[PDB]
RNA sequence: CGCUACUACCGAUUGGAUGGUUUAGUGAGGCCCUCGGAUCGGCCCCGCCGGGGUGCCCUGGCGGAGCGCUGA
RNA sequence: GUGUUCAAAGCAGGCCCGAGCCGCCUGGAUACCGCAGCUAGGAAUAAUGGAAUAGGACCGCGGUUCUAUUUUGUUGGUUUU
RNA sequence: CAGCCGCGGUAAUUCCAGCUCCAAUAGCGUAUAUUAAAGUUGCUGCAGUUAAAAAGCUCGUAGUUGGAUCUUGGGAGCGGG
RNA sequence: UACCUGGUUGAUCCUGCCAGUAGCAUAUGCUUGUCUCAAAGAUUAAGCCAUGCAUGUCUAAGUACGCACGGCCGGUACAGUGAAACUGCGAAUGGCUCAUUAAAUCAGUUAUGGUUCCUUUGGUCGCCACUUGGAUAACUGUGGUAAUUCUAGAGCUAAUACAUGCCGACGGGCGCUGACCCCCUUCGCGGGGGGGAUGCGUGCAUUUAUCAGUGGUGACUCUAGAUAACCUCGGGCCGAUCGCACGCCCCCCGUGGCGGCGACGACCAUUCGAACGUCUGCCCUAUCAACUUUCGAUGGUAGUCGCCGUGCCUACCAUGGUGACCACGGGUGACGGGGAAUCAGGGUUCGAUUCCGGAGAGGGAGCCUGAGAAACGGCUACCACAUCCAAGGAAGGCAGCAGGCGCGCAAAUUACCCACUCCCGACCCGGGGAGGUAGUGACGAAAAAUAACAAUACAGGA
RNA sequence: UCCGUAACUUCGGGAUAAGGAUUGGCUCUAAGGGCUGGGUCGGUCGCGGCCGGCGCCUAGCAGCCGACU
């Protein structure tokens, strides 16, 4: 789509600017240096958990996960847990041993079935050779009568 | 768009014919690719079926075949010398199918040395003993000697091919479609086909 | 025009589905499948109109997604699945096990077989070829691909499938003196003995079939289908045995049997 | 021949009005190739730090730099 | 073909029966579809062809050539039937 | 008034009205295209002395149309009056 | 039912026309009680449109820190419903109209041994691995402009989104190098042979060149095989992938798997098709007799582009191709066909109109995404028209359902429902002015009311 | 230079009708010609001088020259 915009250069003919200060010298403006919001939510995948607390893939991850307290909800200050993705568990490992043991099959099959090759076709070749005897006979009738 | 349709032309009787429908999308062309020589640069194209073509635009290396003895190798394309279809493409150095070129000769030299053990390319005294004397060894005589001696009445290379090696670079032809593929493949000239194109080049000089 | 179709009208339809003109505007449009569109029988038609279990189509949906019906072993929950020919339709809850074979007039009648004999089927060969590594291959007419035939199997020949893992058994050839059944044209749903193959290089080949009662007709070879080793079919057959008794004969039969057959 | 009514014909005016097919110039925009490189990142070039081992580098905390090859 | 209350239409419908039959019988035909195109039979009618500066046939017979595997067991090469 | 022929100029079977009758009947008139009648566009199937109509006469390419003639019987296996 | 009547004259017989006669389809005039079916802005303007609807979608199985409910159970991450947002699929079907268009579309008929194909079905599926990186939505909060389905800056957070990149496997097997060694023979040479360290490569599909000739055809430069190299480069492919329930077997004291699904992938075949070709067939006009061609007309040779074959395009050559058996040019109240009316037999006329195919979305042109579009209820420009406006700028396409203006001889309700038929989707659950259902309706078609009866009389009759 | 050109006519013309485009420097390509040799093998003497049949570029080669468009 076609749309109108203004360039990057600044002059008088504006209405509003957006400015981001990068460091504070000394004075601490009250509107922007006394109060502070906390980061509303925490991480959710294991790798950023271990990045934060420096846990190093020796000890678990479940015990070191942030809990959200239920302030102002009404009555009960419950507390909740996010869910973790990219985690190792009995299910993902069960899935993996299925596929891989089934993917050593599909080549152990087709090899169990190469047994069927050797069996099915490579006996039927071995069966049609005891035949062809009508043929080598029927062209012996050509050759040497 | 750039179309390829055959309803914009005249009939067999030279009678006009009118556009009973407009441009479609399945009847297209695109701009030509006109591959030249230099460092590799390829652009990729999406086409009917969701498949791919590859516009090559600049190529230097190719796979070429000395077919008498069936050895393919990878070499650097030097220059373009003749083209039957048109005579401007040589001035601008475009690679299309059945263009005649010049290439390096060192790989085919090296294989021949390693195979028949003989000095391909007569140099007076400049080339006889840096390493071809080091090539000439018969460490297990009487076991490979009969072999390499049997690989003796099987070389008999032509006079004209020798002159090319002795120069440094030799003729070839192209057999692929680069704006469709992205490759330069081809073969070496030999025999009467070689005679033919030599005559054309030399006459062009006049 | 600018894409493929999704609907089908109702007076556009095949003639053997027997659709009522003054009932609606559309017909079920068999979905994509191994059998053609004209020579098939979708699941709704076999089940709502013939058997008359259900009286709507929504009812058919309510029964298919219970996983009772199953086509030729492998269950199918796509209500618009295109049934074929010589196939098997096994509910097996109440032991039905249908077979889906033509009548004499070409209408895909119902044919009940036993619990046994519902565990195989027969298939015509369409082509053969060898893939990679010299591994032969074989394609039937119902889009079912099978490696490693016996090398004494050629095109337009019949095989008996055990229906669990493919596993061909009991094959037969194309030759004079063996039964045949028709699948197209005008002599549909008739049986006979082949007796000849007149062939033309560059066109369609032809057979001159003869029925036992005396009739002798001819077809294109592609509409042919083989079921017997000579007077001996390997399957249960329907009422009529592929005859096409003429209109005057039916007139005697029914009138004479009318108010005397009861 | 004279009066009366109607239809068509020629007719100066380089007549006029609708359409349509095209020549020659100017030629919006999209697409292709050749360039261009606001901007946003790393191996880093080093200097300030550690852990690990063996004085070595691989990973986690500090500042600059050829605007190199990429990555866009 | 079928008493839709007849008909126009439409493809349905009918049976025994305490109603038990937890069901039974059924139907959803057939024809026409000019002209070109395909397939097999018949050969009157209409058009064309064949031997005239001669040609068909005869283990036909000589002979100048290539000569593929048949025999030369496997072999090296030639004529070899 | 009247599709056409025609009615009305002091006794109107035709105008304006009333009695009476006729035809179709929940339908009937009016206008305009279009079929049959049309053997008045004619292959089936017209006409061409005088009613409309055969070039002033002759030659001539494409087109259309073209003489006679080449195996007939007598038999054979049969079924009737 | 293969049919006729009046009129030229003072009378007759003939040519010959004018008028009557029966149907059918559009309009109007007069009239009207029942009931079953039932067409309807085509003809003139493919002229213009206010207002309102017609395309969206969640399973046991892609992402769940909504805190909106309240499970339950604690805190070993997450029972469970679950708005919004991200992801994948559909929006190219359907519906509407007939302006164009004259061997063109189209009907039958045959070919792709000259090509593409989402989905379905079946086959094959040989030190991120006991699991790597950062990226933004939903959310929190500061705002602009009068203006819209306009958006920015700041702080966090996920994947089957976007990237990255292992293990497994036998020196097992194959081929050409071959150090070395041996046997027999040779006076040696010759020969006649064996084992053999170290090497390089070693597939599915790609590109090319050569060699011999498992399976098939009327028809192979086919399918398969062998050798040398290449990667169509990291904007080449596959070797190799994430989720849900049921519960587990273990020479066993933690491993190897199988069982049962879903999703995706590289190649082959099928299925839905699509698109380029072959043979034959069309209305009127000669006051339309020559036409086409170095501004490709007709062939050849080489290539580019193209999913493939082809003057489809480019260079170099040749001078050809059509025509009285009607080319060429022009007209059509010309979309085509299955078919409709009339009809002794033969014919004449209509066919926009519910089925198939084609074309188009105000007139023209060019494109993105996608398997598929030169889309139009997708984008961008010029022309003609046209709505807001704070005068700076923004938004548009009823030949879709109802409705309106104009136009004219001439053509219905801003109604109810997804219950039937079918379609779409992540789906037994959601949507559908496609579709059904009532309303106006003497276009038209079928049945059928508006009196029956017995005495009183006689006009009279047998 | 390349296209395109009416009325009217004593059919000769009108016609340079009217009306449009292009026009440089430099680097390249293609086409357009001439003369000479082909009588060579043996016989024969001093590169040449006589003889019988050969191959004749018999589908046009090689060599050397030259100005213009
Ligand atoms: Mg008429
Ligand atoms: Mg008649
Ligand atoms: Mg007449
Ligand atoms: Mg007659
Ligand atoms: Mg006369
Ligand atoms: Mg005759
Ligand atoms: Mg008179
Ligand atoms: Mg009349
Ligand atoms: Mg029209
Ligand atoms: Mg039509
Ligand atoms: Mg369109
Ligand atoms: Mg409009
Ligand atoms: Mg468009
Ligand atoms: Mg649309
Ligand atoms: Mg619209
Ligand atoms: Mg409307
Ligand atoms: Mg009306
Ligand atoms: Mg009626
Ligand atoms: Mg003048």
Cα distances (Å, whole numbers) of residue B10 to B5, B15, B17: 12, 5, 6
d(CA B57, CA B54): 9
| Cβ atoms of residues C208 and C196 within 8 Å | yes
Tell me the two tokens of residue A77.
């200050």
Q: How far is the CA of C244 from the centre of ligand 4 (A)?
A: 46
Residue C127 φ/ψ, nearest 5 degrees: -165, 165
Query: Greatest CA separation found in chain A?
Result: 123
* SS3 assignment for chain B: CCCCCCCCCCCCCCCCCCCCCCCCCCCCCCCCCCCEECCCEEEEEEEHHHEEEEEEEEECEEEEEECCCCEEEEEEEEEEEECCCCCCHHHHCCCCCCCEEEEECHHHHHHHHHHHCCCCCCCCCCCCCCCHHHHCCCCCCCCCHHHHHHCCCCCCCCHHHHHHHHHCEEEEEECCCHHHHCCCEEEECCCHHHHHHHHHHHHHHC
Give the residue ranges with Cβ < 7 A from strand E: C 15-16, 18, 20-23, 49-50, 105, 107, 198, 200, 203-204, 206, 247, 254, 261-262
Q: Estimate in Å the CA C87 to C1' H58 gap, whole number.
A: 82
d(CA C143, CA B188): 48
Q: How far is the CA of A90 from the centre of ligand 7 (A)?
A: 125
- Residues ≥6 apart with Cβ < 8 Å to C210: C192, C193, C195, C216, C217
| Dihedral angle sign, alpha carbons of residues C153, C155, C157, C158 | positive
d(CA B158, CA B6): 50
Q: What angle do CA C29, C223, C206 make, to 5 degrees?
A: 150
| Cβ atoms of residues A124 and C150 within 8 Å | yes
Q: How far is the CA of B90 from the centre of ligand 1 (A)?
A: 78
d(CA C108, CA B9): 53
CA of residue B120 relative to chain centroid, distance: 22
Closest CA to C234 of C67, C86, C127, C89: C86
Q: Compare all CA atoms of chain A with the CA of C152 and give the residue at the minimum distance.
A: A128
Tell me the two tokens of residue A49.
């958990």
| Cβ atoms of residues B100 and B82 within 8 Å | yes
The alpha-carbon gap from A46 to the nearest alpha carbon of chain C, in Å, equals: 40
Q: How far is the CA of A115 from the centre of ligand 5 (A)?
A: 110
- Residues ≥6 apart with Cβ < 8 Å to A57: A50
The subunits that touch chain A, with at least 3 C-beta pairs less than 8 Å apart, are C
d(CA C180, CA C192): 5
- Residues ≥6 apart with Cβ < 8 Å to A11: none
- Residues ≥6 apart with Cβ < 8 Å to A66: A42, A82
| Cβ atoms of residues B117 and B149 within 8 Å | no
CB atoms < 10 A from the CB of B66, how many? 20
The alpha-carbon gap from A101 to the nearest alpha carbon of chain C, in Å, equals: 22
Contacts of A128 in chain C (CB under 8 A): 151
Pairing of strands C82-83, C145-147: unpaired
Resolution of the model in angstroms? 3.1
Closest CA to C181 of C225, C137, C215: C225
Contacts of A121 in chain C (CB under 8 A): 148
- Residues ≥6 apart with Cβ < 8 Å to C42: C28, C30, C80, C81, C82, C83
Q: How was this structure determined?
A: cryo-EM
C85: left (phi over 0), alpha (psi -120 to 50) or beta: beta
| Cβ atoms of residues A51 and A60 within 8 Å | no
Tell me the two tokens of residue C55.
């009286």
Cβ pair C148:A120 closer than 8 A = yes
Which nucleotide in the DNA or RNA is closest to residue B91, CA to C1'?
A: H28
Residue A84 DSSP SS3: coil
CB atoms < 10 A from the CB of C179, how many? 21
The alpha-carbon gap from A44 to the nearest alpha carbon of chain C, in Å, equals: 38
Which nucleotide in the DNA or RNA is closest to residue B2, CA to C1'?
A: G305
């Amino acid at each position: 789509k076609r749309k109108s915009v203004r360039g990057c250069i600044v002059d008088a003919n504006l209405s509003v600017l957006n400015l981001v200060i990068v460091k504070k010298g000394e004075k601490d403006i009250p509107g922007l240096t006394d109060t502070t919001v906390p980061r509303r939510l925490g991480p959710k995948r294991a790798s950023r958990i271990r990045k934060l607390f420096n846990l190093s893939k020796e000890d678990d991850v479940r015990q070191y996960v942030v809990r959200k307290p239920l302030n102002k909800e009404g009555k009960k200050p419950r507390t909740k847990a996010p869910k973790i993705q990219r985690l190792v568990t009995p299910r993902v490992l069960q899935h993996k041993r299925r596929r891989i043991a089934l993917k050593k099959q599909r080549t152990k099959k087709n090899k169990e079935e190469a047994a069927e090759y050797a069996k099915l076709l490579a006996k039927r070749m071995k069966e049609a050779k005891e035949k062809r005897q009508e043929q080598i006979a029927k062209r012996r009738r050509l050759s040497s009568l | 768009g750039i179309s390829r349709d055959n309803w914009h032309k005249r009939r067999k009787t030279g009678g006009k014919r009118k556009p009973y429908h407009k441009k479609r999308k399945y009847e297209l062309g695109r701009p030509a690719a006109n591959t030249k020589i230099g460092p590799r640069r390829i652009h990729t194209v999406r086409v009917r079926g969701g498949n791919k073509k590859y516009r090559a635009l600049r190529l230097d290396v190719g796979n070429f075949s000395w077919g008498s003895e069936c050895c393919t190798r990878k070499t650097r394309i030097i220059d373009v010398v003749y083209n039957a279809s048109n005579n401007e493409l040589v001035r601008t150095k475009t690679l299309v199918k059945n263009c005649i070129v010049l290439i390096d000769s060192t790989p085919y030299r090296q294989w021949y040395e390693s195979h028949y053990a003989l000095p391909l390319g007569r140099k007076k005294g400049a080339k006889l003993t840096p390493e071809e004397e080091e090539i000439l060894n018969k460490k297990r005589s009487k076991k490979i000697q009969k072999k390499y001696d049997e690989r003796k009445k099987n070389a008999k290379i032509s006079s004209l091919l020798e002159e090319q090696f002795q120069q440094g670079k030799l003729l070839a032809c192209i057999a692929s479609r680069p704006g469709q593929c992205g490759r330069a493949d081809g073969y070496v000239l030999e025999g009467k086909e070689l005679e033919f194109y030599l005559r054309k080049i030399k006459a062009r000089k006049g | 025009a600018r894409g493929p179709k999704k609907h089908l009208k109702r007076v556009a339809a095949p003639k053997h589905w027997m659709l009522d003109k003054l009932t609606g505007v559309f017909a079920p449009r068999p979905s994509t499948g191994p059998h053609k569109l004209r020579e098939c029988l979708p699941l709704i038609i076999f089940l709502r109109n013939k058997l008359k279990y259900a009286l709507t189509g929504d009812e058919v949906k309510k029964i298919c997604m219970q996983r009772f019906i199953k086509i030729d072993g492998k269950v199918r929950a796509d209500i618009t699945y295109p049934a074929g020919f010589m196939d098997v339709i096994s509910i097996d809850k109440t032991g039905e096990n249908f077979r889906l074979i033509y009548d004499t007039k070409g209408r895909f009648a119902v044919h009940r077989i036993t619990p046994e004999e519902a565990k195989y089927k027969l298939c015509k060969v369409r082509k053969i070829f060898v893939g990679t590594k010299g591994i032969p291959h074989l394609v039937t007419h119902d889009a079912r691909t099978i490696r490693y035939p016996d090398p004494l199997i050629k095109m337009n020949d019949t095989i008996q499938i055990d229906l669990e893992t493919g596993k061909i058994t009991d094959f037969i050839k194309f030759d004079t003196g063996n039964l045949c059944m028709v699948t197209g044209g005008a002599n549909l749903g008739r049986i006979g003995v082949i007796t000849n193959r007149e062939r033309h290089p560059g066109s369609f080949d032809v057979v001159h079939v003869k029925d036992a009662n005396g009739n002798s007709f001819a077809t294109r070879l592609s509409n042919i289908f083989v079921i017997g080793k000579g007077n001996k079919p390997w399957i249960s057959l329907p009422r009529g045995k592929g005859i096409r008794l003429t209109i005057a004969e039916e007139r005697d039969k029914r009138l004479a049997a009318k108010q005397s057959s009861g």
